[PDB]
Structures are given as structure tokens and as C-alpha cells.
């Protein structure tokens, strides 16, 4: 029972220690506090009544902002996003391209507005400062960690851009890990519109901050000594719309391509499996088979660990967006398999991160532009950082499965 | 009656004089002629029979080019832009993304073709030359003013690009003002497809040329001494399609974002107004309340000035595209309020300009690239130029309301 | 009969000889072998049983990859690409924007994956080497010719990019000609989805390799002496999706614009023809009238040569994509004219090339970036190279019409 989870946590921490660049330099105050905050944050918002109330309050607000944003998409696509669509096409009346993608545009505009107004900086400063006084992490790395709660891996470091070129390897690694452990407001709204529970997405975003520092500081302890805008609000909103347009277009093409490539891989796997008596072989069977142990380890019941493995595996080998798109159907009454409410929570939490190999190329471009002489360092540390981020998502799922 | 309008005109001119950089350097020939042409142009095409006939003749031609362009969108979107759409979804069968936006693509291609063929240059040279001999404005600023009738603020100066780096501050200011006072062929076709009357759009585009010079030369009189391509027609058309694609994508994302942000602002305003006994508070009430005087001043009947204020206010604080999108419904039998045909004309004319604060950032990039050392000057003069452009749109609306 | 074709071939070769930069330097081994391979390849796959079987086998595979890729578009557009669309809108239920364009995205991703895995390089090396040992063409120009079977004119030279800056004028010209004579995997899948027969598209792509060298070496014989990557497979797929997105967007805007401009040209032609007693005058009549001789010359029956001319003419003056879009309707039971199965094959083959004037601007940018000092040479040789490519497509159509 609750024992299989506390071992899950122990195993995750252990792997990080085994992979550390220097176990003897690990600061127990830093890593102990970091775990304590991620664990307590979970308990607070997933277990204690007052916590559950703040979480549901924040989630309902987010759900309202989303609905407000949909007035814009309704203006652009009209009847193609109305109730009439379900009467005519049934299930296929939900057009993903017009229901989900335009949300990334509206959220980016909104986030850009909140930065111009100083609202983001205000929230980041309080959370980032809380982390550093509690953990002894540097100022710049703590701010980047907090910013990553709300924005993507290449956007979050912008709040400390002048300090990036000269941060320590341990600081730069943490900055990467905070990005890989979290997601971003725009896609969060996307996943929600796909049916993923907002409470889970919000909780996982907040837990990514200490989670990312926890595993960065286990795997890459500090061995050095750290140191230490649009003309108006309308231009801010337009610049945000433009960046989100570009994001929406990219995510759309990636989904058409990746989902297409998986179908082709499955056609090939069936013909190849056939030579070995397994004509039914598919990419989902390999991944389920291969990741079931890990799913079991974080608290998925033995009889659901294999289906859970498919989703977790897909997020790791491809990205969380392709994974969520294959997981969303299991969140509706038309699911091929009815999963426990606890297994749904665990999958939702473990998928909630940008941790995958392709995020390295993105960090090289985006985070690299802030410190062009540190691109060698980013490439070198890329794989470890993806592992760090993966461990953080897994730890959050274990904690969540525990308190549920 | 016709008295409330002639005072409207007087007030608009007066504000410009009050804001001038040097009232004593204002050239009466220049500003008197400029007003005389804008006023007479209106009379000619809105009042005198032969004028009304040329205008309706030009508008019908434009309406035919639009219909021709729709064959291309029909090929791409098929049934989604057919009559069957209205039978199935009713009013929401009109999909804005496929009905309006593709028109920007076709018009840009067409404009690019007419430049390659020398047809644009020919028309610009006649109108621009007529202006300068009549007003004593410089050659380059007069050409830019005429070009702005047909193309956007960043495209119009291209006909005089080699002379821009060295124009006088008064010349550069006029170039900006001609851009802010007008629109462009692509979006004109958009507004028409939305239901805005072509006659009004065309008339306002032509009146923007003297109107923009009028207010530039009132607010920034000349105190210095002024001076003085695609390989084939198919590449021209393709380069124009490509630029219009980019424009269509940007306008679409801006609409999803801005309309979304207004709905969120309204949710917030309702909760905030509620603390003061006004739970019904919205952004449209603030703007209507705030701009009613101005609407009244240009000839909107007292009892329609508040609804007129909403649209005029929205165009000023955001842009004309968001404004037209909220005004278009009042042009159909399904309008929340039936407005006089005179109030519809006045709103249509006063919305017909790129004059807003966000157009400054666009001028900095586009007009700045032609004269990188004059970017400081553009930023400095930005706000005055937006005011100049606003006065020009307002003056055109007053003149139009008068002759109707 | 079969005589009218062998004269077609003779005429095509003759024009090339007449236009040569030096008929006395033409290498008979090179040009004789090149023609022998194009002709024999046709015979092999269009006539001999075993050949027809390999071709239909390769075409069916391609047809399966396409269907696999459509799972991705189905996820993004849902009901708008389902069988229900035809019940509601009938013929107009086929939305080109969602049926055809997303295929360019999936194919680009796939091609990018096959390069990362070394599968493309492997196939190119065998075919390119076969060509050079047989023809005595240089190594680099032979590889570029083979690569052009599968990828576009600006992508194919990438397999020999370090050698491009220093190739001979005859080599550079051949590189251009291989691009103009062929198409690319992405658009091939597009044309197929439009109804064009895959067997024809595949056969024409393979015949473009010797065909392009044949006419390059007739028109620009060698008079000089020739000489002689994404971090992982997921980044490869994403980079390919992104490039194909950009391509899909461009092709879409070009189609809206060009088809729109043709409708406007037709409105104007009707009014102008009217002054000469031909109110029915259209762009298709001019092109059919003007290209009928050429269509007749390649084996189109006298009574179908005029309709065939429309399509061939349109591909030459605009591009093959606009042409295929006007030709596709004649491939369905709802065709305005029922054409012989032989006339359909001939049109399909003669349209199958990037040979048009606009492809020069594209070669300047793409091929020019590989050798910035050779841009002058590319511009100078552009028109001859388009003629060379056109002759290659025409020759392939004649050969095909012969063996059918
Ligand atoms: C959708 C279903 C199909 C899923 C199956 C796909 C599995 C592919 C695994 C990725 O392969 C590796 O990825 C690394 C990450 O990019 C590369 O690191 C190389 O590149 C840099 C990446 O960080 C360096 O950090 C590394 O040290 C190293 O040099 C490495 O070469 C590459 O072989
Ligand atoms: C959709 C409904 C909501 C509507 C409400 C929004 C109202 C916002 C008003 C804009 O605020 C100002 O805009 C100026 C224009 O950009 C800025 O000028 C600054 O920036 C340059 C702009 O030109 C300079 O010209 C100026 O002198 C100045 O420095 C200025 O700082 C900024 O405060
Ligand atoms: C859709 C229905 C309508 C169809 C009718 C359109 C017909 C237009 C024909 C194109 O005109 C020529 O195209 C050349 C190719 O671009 C140009 O070459 C010029 O530009 C370079 C192109 O290669 C050089 O190679 C040339 O030598 C030359 O200087 C040339 O100037 C231009 O006049
Ligand atoms: O704001 C965002 C959204 C997405 N992604 C990338 O796109 C993938 C799919 O969401 C993620 O894993 C991440 O690599 C970002 O980098 N930033
Ligand atoms: O050709 C165009 C079309 C639009 N816009 C910008 O987009 C806004 C919305 O139409 C305008 O106010 C203007 O700022 C341009 O600058 N040029
Ligand atoms: O991969 C591609 C696809 C299209 N095109 C260009 O786009 C036109 C339309 O397909 C072609 O003739 C060619 O000029 C390319 O250059 N490369
Ligand atoms: Na983040
Ligand atoms: Na203009
Ligand atoms: Na090719």
C-alpha cells in the first residue's frame, strides 16, 4: 500500500544519487528542503481540506480565463466550434485544430500582458525568494525555477538573462532542469481543453519548482561560487499573440507529422512482428511492456501498469503533447479501458513536463541565445538534465498517488 | 443641424492648431488647400450626381475583383464557404477565418502585380503631383500620401525610399501621418467582406491623402528646407501572396487574442463594477461613455452618440480591425440597435484609419528599416502623429455626415 | 501511329541541339546513354510485365504511407475530413486545405527521418553511381540528379554541398536542370491525393534523373574539367515537419492568389475579347490554342490536343501545382470532357516537373546560399535551364504515350 510509494520515492532519489557528478558535494539542507517542499506542497493541496480549496479555487479561475479566451476563437471559426458540430459529426465534431490550438495564442498574449504590468515579476519574486532563503540556492536559479511554473523553458530564464552568461555549471544545469521539469501556461490550457484535469496540471506546475531544484542539486551539486520591453500594454498583447501563433503552428505540424509517423511505424511493426509470430505488434505494446515496471514503481496497480506505461513511455521518447493526445480518450466515457481515478492522477502528473530529448535542441537555441559561449555546456549537460526532469515528474506522480 | 458639423470641423482644426510645434510657421496655402481638397472631394463624390456615379462605378469594380478573388478561397476551403453552410449552422455558417482572411492574400498578390506592371506608379504620380502643385508640399511626401490611398503605412513610403533617410522632420512626420490616416487595399477588401459599405471605404481612402497632409502640416509645419523588383510578373504575384499570408496569419492571431482579452476584461469589470453597484460594467460602457462627446461633435445624433462611442473608442485604444468586427453586426437585420443611415456612415468613416498607438511600433520597424538613423525621430513623433491621423479620420467623418 | 511519337522525340532532341552552347562539344556517349536510359526505363516499367509489377508494387507502398500519414491529419481536423463531409456538402465535402496540404507536412518529416537514418543516402549513392559510370557525368552532378527523384530542387544539391561552389558551369547547369525536371516526395503525395495516378508520378520522378542530364548535356556540354545534422531521429522528424509546414502554408497562399488572379484575368479577357467579337475569351482558350501543337507533337490525338494544351500551358506559364488543380477534375466521373486513358497519361507526365520561370528565383535563393559567388551564373543560365527541364518533361510524356 502506502509502502510501495515511499519506496518509489526512495528509488527515484537513489538513481539521482547514483548519477551525481559528486555525491560528496551534495548539500543536505538544499536537497532535504527541496524534497520537503515538494512533498509538503502535495500534502497541502491534495490532502488537507484548506489546501484542496485553494487549489480548486485557482483551477476554477483558470477554467474561467480559458472560457473567456474562447470568445476569440468563436469569432474566428464560428459554427465549426459550436454545439451543432456534435449533432452532425458526433464525436468527430470536436475539431482539435480550432478547439485547442487557438488557446495557445490567447494564453501567450495574456502572459505577455501580465509581464508588462509587473504582475508576473511580483509573483515570481515572492516564490523565488521563498525558495532561495529556504534552500540556499542562488538568487538567479531560484527565480528561474519559480518563473517556470507559469512559462516555458526558454521564456523562464529571461527574468534573469543578464546573469546567465556567467552562472556556474551547477546554476546553468538547474536552469535547464527547471525548464524540463515543468510546462507552460499556454499548453496547460491546451491539455485542459483536451480533458486533462486542471487541478492536476496546476498542482504539477507548482511542484515542478522544488522538484526541479531537488534533482538538479542531487545530480549536479554546486562545486563553484555563484555571484550576487514593449512600448505599451497593447503592443505587449500583440507580441504575445504573435509568439503564440508561431507556437500553435509548430505544435500543429508536429502533431500531424508525429501521429502520422507512429501509424507508419505501427504498419511496419505489424509486418516485422509477423516474422516472429506477433502480427499484432505495435509501438504502444513495446512502450507499455518497457515502461510498466516504472509505472508500477510510482504506484500504478499491477493490472493497469502496462496501459500506464504506454503513455509515460510515449512522453519520454517523443513529447508530452503526443502522449496527452493518446491519453485524453481514456478520460471520457468512451475509453477503451476504464482506469482507476488514482491511475488517472498518476499518469496526469508523470506526463506533466517538457522532459524529453528534443527539448535539448530547444534549450540550445533559446537558452543558448542568452549566453552564446555556454552552448557547449548546454549540449554536454543535456542528457543528464532530461533525466533530472524526468525524475522530478515521476516523483511528483508518486507523491500525488500517495496522498490520493 | 448642418451647423453642428461646421463647428465639428472648426473644433478639429482648432485642436491641431493648439498642438502645433509652431503655429506661426503654419502655411495657410498648404493647410487651406489641404482642407479645401478633402472637403471638396467629399462634396464631389458624396453629393454631386456625377461624383456619386464615379464612386459607385469604382466601388462596383472593387466588388467584382473581390468576387473574382473568392474563386481561390473556394478552391481551398470548398463546402466550408458555400451556401450549404447557412442551412446547417445558420448565422454561424459564415466562417470569418475562411471568408475574410484569404482576401488579404489575394489583394496583396494583386497589388504586387500592379506595381510590377507600372499601373500603381502611374496612378500615384498623377495624384501625388496634383497634391504638391496645389499645396506646395514636397515631392516625396506628396507621393507617399497618394500611395497610402491603396497600400499600408509601411508599404507606401517604398515609392520614395531613397529620399527618406534625408527628409526633414516635417516630411518624415507627414509620411507617418499619411500612413496613420489611411488603411490599405487588402484590409479594405476585408472590411467590405464583413459588410462595411465599399463606397464609404473607398471615399475615406481617397480623402485620407489630403486629410493626412492637412493635419501633418498643422501640427508639424515645415521649418527646414526639403530637397529635390521581382524578375517577372509571376514572381511578383507570388511575393505578394507570401506577404499577405503573413499578414493574414498575424491579423487572425491578433483577433483571437484581443477579442479573448476583451471578454476577460469584461468578466473582471463586472466583478469590480459590482463593488460600486455596477455589476453590469463592461469595456463597451466605459468607451461609449468616454467617447460619446466626440461622436456627438462629429454629427452623431444625441441618442446614438453613446453606441457610436463604443466603436470609435475601440478603434482608438486597440485598432480599427477589432472595432469593425464589433460594428459589423449593427450593419445587418440582426443588429442589437437600429442606427440611422447617417450614423452608420459616420462610424464607417471615423473607423477608417490605422491611427492607433500600436501602429507606432509598426512604423518603427517598417519605416525605420528605410532610414535606421531616423528611428529616434519616429519614436519621438509617434504620439503626435497618431493624434494627427485620428483628427484626419474624424474630419472625414464630419464632412461625410454633413453631405449626407 | 507510333511514328508520330518517334518524331516527337526527334523534334525535342533537335530543339536542344539547336539551343546548345556548343554542339561540337556534345559527348555522344553521355547524351546517347542518357536518352537510352530514360527510354529503356519507360519501356521496362510501362511495358514489360515484370517492370509493371515493380512499379505497381512501389506505388502501392507509397499509397500506404500516404494513408498512414492521414491518421495525423484526421487527429487535427476530425469530422471535417470524414465520410460525413460528402453526405452534407456532396462534392464540396472534400476540403483541399485539410486533405492535401497536411500531406506535405508528413512527407517532409518522413524524408528528414530517412536522411538521418542513412536510407536516402544509400539509395542515392547506388543510382547516382550507376548514372556516372554509364554516362561519364561527374560524381557530384550524378548524385544531385538521383537525389532529385525523391526531393525538391533546393534540397537535392545538399548531398553534395561542399562541391557546389567550385563546380563547372556545365555541372551547375546540370544541377539546376535536375531540379527543374523533377518534383519532390511531398508534393507527389499531394498530387496523388488530388487523384493523379501514383504509377505515373513515380515513373516520371525516376525518368527525370536521366532526362535532366540528357537535356543539360545537350544544351550545356562540358567544356571544362570537373574535380574529384539533427542530434537525434526525433529532432530530425520535427525539423522536417517544420519545413513542410512552411511549404504547406506557401503553397496554400499561392493557390488562393493564383486561382483568384486567373478568375480576374478571365473577367478582363471576356470584356476585352468582347471588343473583337469574342466575349467568351478566357485564359484557357489562349493556352489551349497556343500549346495544342506541342500537345499534338507528343502524341495527343488531334481532337484532344486543345484541351491538353490548356494544362500543359498553365504548368509552363504558372506552375505544375496550379495546372494539376485544374486537371484533377478531368480524372473523375464528373469531368467536363472524357479523355482517352492515353491522353490522361501524357498530360500527367508532361505536368510532372518544377520547370517554370518562378523556379529560377527559388534556385537563386536555395541553390545560391550554397555558393553565394555563383548567383550571377544561376541567373544567367536560368531561362535555358527551364527550357531544358521542360524538354525533359515533354520527352518523358512522349516515351510514356508511346509505350501505352
Ligand atoms: C516516436 C517513437 C520512436 C522512438 C525511438 C527513438 C529513440 C532515439 C534516441 C535518441 O538518440 C540519441 O539522442 C541523443 C540526444 O540528442 C544524442 O546525443 C548526442 O547529442 C547531444 C544531445 O544532448 C549530446 O548531449 C549527446 O552527448 C550526444 O552527443 C544521441 O547522439 C542520439 O543517438
Ligand atoms: C483593449 C482595451 C484596453 C485599452 C487600454 C490601454 C491604454 C494604454 C495606453 C498606452 O500607454 C502609453 O502608450 C505610449 C505609446 O506607445 C507609450 O509612449 C512611450 O513610448 C513611445 C511611443 O511612441 C514614445 O513615443 C512615448 O514618448 C513614450 O516614451 C507610453 O509609455 C505608454 O505608457
Ligand atoms: C498566369 C497567367 C499569366 C501568364 C503570363 C506571364 C508571362 C510572363 C513572362 C516572363 O517575363 C520574363 O521572365 C524572365 C524570367 O524571370 C525575365 O528574365 C530576366 O530575369 C532573369 C531570369 O532568369 C534573367 O535570367 C533573364 O536573363 C532576364 O534578365 C524577364 O525579364 C521577364 O520579362
Ligand atoms: O512553451 C512551450 C511549449 C512547448 N515546447 C516544446 O514543445 C514540446 C511539446 O509541447 C515540449 O515538450 C517542449 O519541447 C516548448 O519548448 N515551449
Ligand atoms: O497592411 C496593413 C494592415 C494592417 N496593419 C496594422 O494592423 C492593424 C489592424 O488592421 C492596423 O491598425 C495597422 O496597425 C498594417 O500596418 N498594415
Ligand atoms: O519542394 C518543393 C515544392 C515546390 N516548389 C516550388 O513550388 C512550385 C509549386 O509546386 C514548384 O514548381 C516549385 O517552384 C519547390 O521549389 N520545392
Ligand atoms: Na516551465
Ligand atoms: Na495607407
Ligand atoms: Na526534384
Q: Secondary structure of chain C in the HEC alphabet?
A: CHHHHHHHHHHHHHHHHHHCCCHHHCCHHHHHHHHHHHHHHHHHHHCCHHHHHHHHHHHHHHHHHHHHHHHHHHHHHHHHHCCHHHHHHHHHHCCHHHHCHHHHHHHHHHHHHHHHCCHHHHHHHHHHHHHHHHHCCCHHHHHHHHHCCCCCCCCHHHHHHHHCCCCCHHHHHHHHHHHHHCCCHHHHHHHHHHCCCHHHHHHHHHHHHHHHHHHHHHHCCCCCCCCCCCCCHHHHHHHHHHHHHHHHHHHHHHHHHHHHHHHHHHHHHHHHHHHHCCCCCCHHHHHHHHHHHHHHHCCCCHHHHHHHHHHHHHHHHCCHHHHHHHHHHHHCCCCCCCCCHHHHHHHHHHCCCCCCCHHHHHHHHHCHHHCHHHHHHHHHHHHHHHHHHHHHHHHHHHHHHHHC
Chains that touch B (3 or more CB pairs under 8 A): A, C
- Cell readout for B331 is 450593419
Say if residues B81 and B99 touch (Cβ distance below 8 Å). yes
Q: Which of C250, C260, C261 to mutate to test the interface with B (most CBs of B within 10 A)?
A: C260
Q: What is the number of the ligand 5 atom nearest to the C-alpha of B358? A: 14
A211: Cβ contacts below 8 Å, ≥ 6 apart: A34, A38, A181, A392, A393, A395, A396
Q: Return the H-helix or E-strand segment holding A37.
A: helix A28-46
Give the H or E element holding residue B367. Answer: none
Query: Minimum-distance ligand to the CA of C386?
Result: 3
Whole-angstrom Cα distance, residue A385 to residue A19? 11
Burial level of B332, CB count in 10 A (0-12/13-18/19+)?
exposed
Q: How far is the CA of B356 from the centre of ligand 2 (A)?
A: 10
In this structure, what C-alpha cell is assigned to residue A272? 516485422
Closest alpha carbon to C349 in C215, C252, C154, C211: C211
Contact predicate B339/B307, CB 8 Å: yes
Contact C230 A261 (CB under 8 A): no
Do residue C257 and residue B68 have CB atoms under 8 angstroms apart?
Answer: no
Q: What share of chain A is helix, strand, coil (3-state, %, to 5)?
A: 80, 0, 20
Q: Please, are residues C142 and C132 in contact by the beta-carbon 8 Å criterion?
A: yes
- Do B91 and B334 contact (CB within 8 A), yes or no? yes
C263: nearest CB among B68, B109, B249: B68
Interchain proximity C75–A96, CB inside 8 Å: yes
Q: What residue's CA is closest to ligand 2, atom 20?
A: A231
Answer for the pair B171, B225: CB distance below 8 angstroms, yes or no. Answer: no
Where are any strands of DSSP class E within B260-384? none
Of C206, C322, C162, C203, residue with least CA distance to C255: C322
A38: its cell numbers: 515538494
- CA separation for the pair A265, A259 (Å, rounded): 10
A152 lines ligand 4 (CB under 6 A): yes
B231 CA distance to ligand 3 centroid (A)? Answer: 6
Q: What is the DSSP code (8-state) at residue B164?
A: S
Non-local (6+) Cβ contacts of B256 within 8 A are: A69, A72, A73, A75, A76, A102, A105, A106, A241
Half-sphere exposure of C277 (CA within 13 A, CB side): 0
Q: Do B180 and B364 form a contact (C-beta atoms < 8 A)?
A: no
How many residues are listed for chain B in this entry?
404
Which atom of ligand 4 is nearest the CA belonging to A152?
Answer: 1
Cell numbers representing residue B137 in the block = 508640399
Give chain B's radius of gyration (CA, Å).
Answer: 21
Question: Most distant CA pair in chain A: distance in Å?
Answer: 66
CA dihedral over A64, A65, A66, A71, signed as positive or negative = positive
Report the distance separating Cα B141 and Cα B174, nearest Å.
Answer: 7
Taking residue C12's Cβ as centre, other Cβ atoms within 10 Å add up to 24
Breakpoints of chain C, after residues (C–N > 2.5 Å): 228
Name the one residue in this structure whose C-alpha cell is 445587418. Answer: B332
A235 touches chain B (CB under 8 A): yes
**Residue C267 to residue B73, Cβ atoms within 8 A:** no
Interface membership of A109 toward B (CB under 8 Å): yes
**3-class DSSP state of B77:** helix
Rounded to an integer, what is the distance from CA C205 to the centroid of its chain?
Answer: 7
Label residue A276 exposed, middle or buried (CB < 10 Å: 0-12, 13-18, 19+).
Answer: exposed
Record the cell numbers describing residue A139, joined without a space.
538568487
Q: Would the CB atoms of B75 and C96 count as touching at under 8 Å? A: yes
- CA–centroid distance, B354 to ligand 5, in Å, is 6
Q: What is the residue whose three cell numbers read 539542507?
A: A29
Question: Cα torsion at B161, B165, B167, B169 (round to 10°)?
Answer: 120
- Do residues B223 and A28 lie in contact, with contact meaning Cβ atoms separated by under 8 Å? no
How many Å apart are CA A298 and CA A397, to the nearest integer? 7
Cα–Cα distances in Å, from B250 out to B97, B239, C127?
A: 12, 17, 45
CA–CA gap between residue A172 and residue A141 (Å, rounded): 8
Q: What is the C-alpha separation between A369 and A371, in angstroms, rounded?
A: 5
At C9, list the grid cell. Answer: 522525340
**CB within 8 Å of A36: residues ≥ 6 apart:** none
Q: Is the C-beta atom of C150 inside 6 A of ligand 6?
A: no
d(CA C296, CA C302): 6
Distance of alpha carbon B191 from alpha carbon B210, whole angstroms: 22
Q: What are the grid coordinates assigned to B226, written together?
A: 526639403
Which residue, chain included where needed, has cell 478582363? C268
Q: Which residues line ligand 1 (CB under 6 A)?
A: A 283, 317-318, 357, 360, 379, 382-383; C 231-234
Continuous segment of H or E residues that includes residue B315:
helix B305-317
Q: A14 Cβ partners below 8 Å, 6+ apart?
A: none
For cell 561542399, the residue is C162
Closest Cα of chain A to C341: distance in Å?
33
Question: What is the spatial distance between Cα A242 and Cα A109, in angstroms, rounded to a whole number?
Answer: 8
- Pick from C316, C347, C25: which is nearest to C204 by CA? C347
State how far the Cα of C2 lies from the Cα of A60, in Å rounded to an integer: 77
| Half-sphere CA count of A101, side-chain side, radius 13 A | 25
d(C-alpha B296, C-alpha C228), whole Å = 81
Residues of C in Cβ contact (< 8 Å) with A328: none
Which ligand neighbours the alpha carbon of B255 most closely? 5
What is d(CA B84, CA B93) in angstroms, rounded to the nearest whole number?
8
Nearest to C339 by CA among C368, C314, C363, C309: C309
- Other C-beta atoms closer than 10 Å to the C-beta of A379 total 15
* Cα-to-centroid distance, C364 and ligand 1 (Å): 35
* Residue from C178, C251, C319, C354 whose mutation best tests the ligand 6 pocket (most atoms within 8 A of CB): C354
Asked if B192 contacts B63 with a C-beta cutoff of 8 angstroms, the reply is yes
Distance from the A96 Cα atom to the nearest Cα atom in chain C, whole angstroms: 5
Query: Which of A70, A88, A244 lies at the smallest CB-CB distance from B253?
Result: A244
Helix (H) or strand (E) holding A159: none
- Mutate which of C62, C70, C80, C185 to test chain A, going by most A C-beta atoms within 10 A? C80
CB pairs under 8 A between B and C: 114
CB C112 within 8 A of CB C236: yes
Reported residue count of chain C is 404
Closest C-alpha among A248, A239, A102, C91 to residue B96? A102
Pocket-testing residue among C157, C251, C259, C362, ligand 6, by greatest number of atoms within 8 A of Cβ: C362
- What resolution in angstrom units was achieved for this structure? 2.4
Task: Please give the distance, rounded to the nearest whole angstrom, from the Cα atom of residue B62 to the centre of ligand 4.
Answer: 44
The reply to whether residue C77 touches residue A93, judged by beta carbons under 8 angstroms, is: no
What technique determined this structure?
X-ray
CA angle B266, B267, B271 (to 5 degrees): 110
Residue C68 to residue A264, Cβ atoms within 8 A: yes
User: In chain A, count of helices (H) and strands (E)?
Assistant: 18, 0
Which residues in chain B have their CB less than 8 angstroms from residue A234's CB? Answer: 317-318, 356-358
Cα–Cα distance between A182 and B353 in angstroms, integer?
43
Give the whole-angstrom CA distance, residue B327 versus residue B344: 9
Cell of C362: 527559388
Q: How far is the CA of B62 from the centre of ligand 8 (A)?
A: 17
Instruction: Answer whether C324's CB lies under 8 Å from C196's CB.
Output: yes
Residue B323: CB within 6 Å of ligand 2?
A: no
Residue C362: count other Cβ atoms within 10 Å of its Cβ. 18
Cα angle: B266, vertex B272, B277; to 5 degrees: 110
* Cell reading at A323: 502522449
Q: Determine if ligand 6 sits within 6 Å of the CB of residue C325.
A: no
Amino acid at each position: 500500500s502506502l509502502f510501495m510509494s515511499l519506496i518509489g520515492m526512495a528509488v527515484l532519489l537513489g538513481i539521482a544519487v547514483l548519477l551525481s557528478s559528486n555525491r560528496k558535494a551534495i548539500n543536505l539542507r538544499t536537497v532535504g528542503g527541496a524534497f520537503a517542499i515538494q512533498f509538503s506542497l502535495g500534502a497541502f493541496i491534495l490532502y488537507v481540506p484548506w489546501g484542496q480549496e485553494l487549489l480548486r479555487g485557482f483551477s476554477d479561475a483558470v477554467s474561467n480565463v480559458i472560457n473567456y479566451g474562447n470568445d476569440g476563437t468563436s469569432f474566428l471559426f464560428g459554427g465549426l466550434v459550436s454545439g451543432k458540430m456534435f449533432e452532425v459529426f458526433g464525436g468527430g465534431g470536436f475539431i482539435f485544430a480550432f478547439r485547442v490550438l487557438p488557446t495557445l495564442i490567447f494564453f501567450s498574449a495574456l502572459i505577455s500582458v501580465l509581464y508588462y504590468l509587473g504582475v508576473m515579476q511580483w509573483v515570481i519574486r515572492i516564490l523565488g525568494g521563498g525558495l532561495q532563503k529556504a534552500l540556499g540556492t542562488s538568487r538567479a536559479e531560484s527565480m528561474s525555477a519559480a518563473a517556470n511554473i507559469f512559462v516555458g523553458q526558454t521564456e523562464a530564464p529571461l527574468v534573469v538573462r543578464p546573469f546567465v552568461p556567467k552562472m556556474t555549471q551547477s546554476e546553468l544545469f538547474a536552469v535547464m532542469c527547471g525548464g524540463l521539469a515543468s510546462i507552460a501556461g499556454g499548453v496547460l490550457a491546451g491539455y485542459a481543453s483536451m480533458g486533462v484535469k486542471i487541478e492536476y496540471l496546476v498542482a504539477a506546475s507548482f511542484m515542478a519548482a522544488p522538484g526541479g531544484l531537488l534533482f538538479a542539486k542531487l545530480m549536479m551539486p554546486e562545486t563553484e561560487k555563484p555571484q550576487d520591453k514593449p512600448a505599451n500594454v497593447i503592443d505587449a498583447a500583440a507580441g504575445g499573440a504573435s509568439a503564440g501563433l508561431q507556437l500553435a503552428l509548430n505544435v500543429g505540424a508536429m502533431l500531424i507529422a508525429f501521429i502520422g509517423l507512429i501509424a507508419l511505424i505501427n504498419g511496419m511493426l505489424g509486418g516485422i512482428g509477423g516474422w516472429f509470430g506477433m502480427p499484432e505488434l505495435k509501438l504502444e505494446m513495446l512502450l507499455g511492456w518497457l515502461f510498466a515496471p516504472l509505472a508500477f514503481l510510482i504506484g500504478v496497480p499491477w493490472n493497469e501498469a502496462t496501459v500506464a506505461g504506454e503513455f509515460i513511455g510515449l512522453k519520454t521518447v517523443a513529447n508530452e503533447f503526443v502522449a496527452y493526445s493518446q491519453f485524453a480518450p481514456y478520460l471520457t466515457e468512451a475509453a477503451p479501458v476504464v482506469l482507476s481515478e488514482k491511475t488517472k492522477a498518476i499518469i496526469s502528473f508523470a506526463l506533466c513536463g517538457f522532459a524529453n530529448l528534443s527539448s535539448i535542441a530547444i534549450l540550445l537555441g533559446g537558452l543558448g541565445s542568452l549566453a552564446p559561449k555556454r552552448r557547449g555546456d548546454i549540449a554536454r549537460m543535456g542528457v543528464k538534465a532530461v533525466i533530472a526532469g524526468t525524475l522530478s515528474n515521476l516523483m511528483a506522480a508518486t507523491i500525488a498517488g500517495f496522498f490520493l
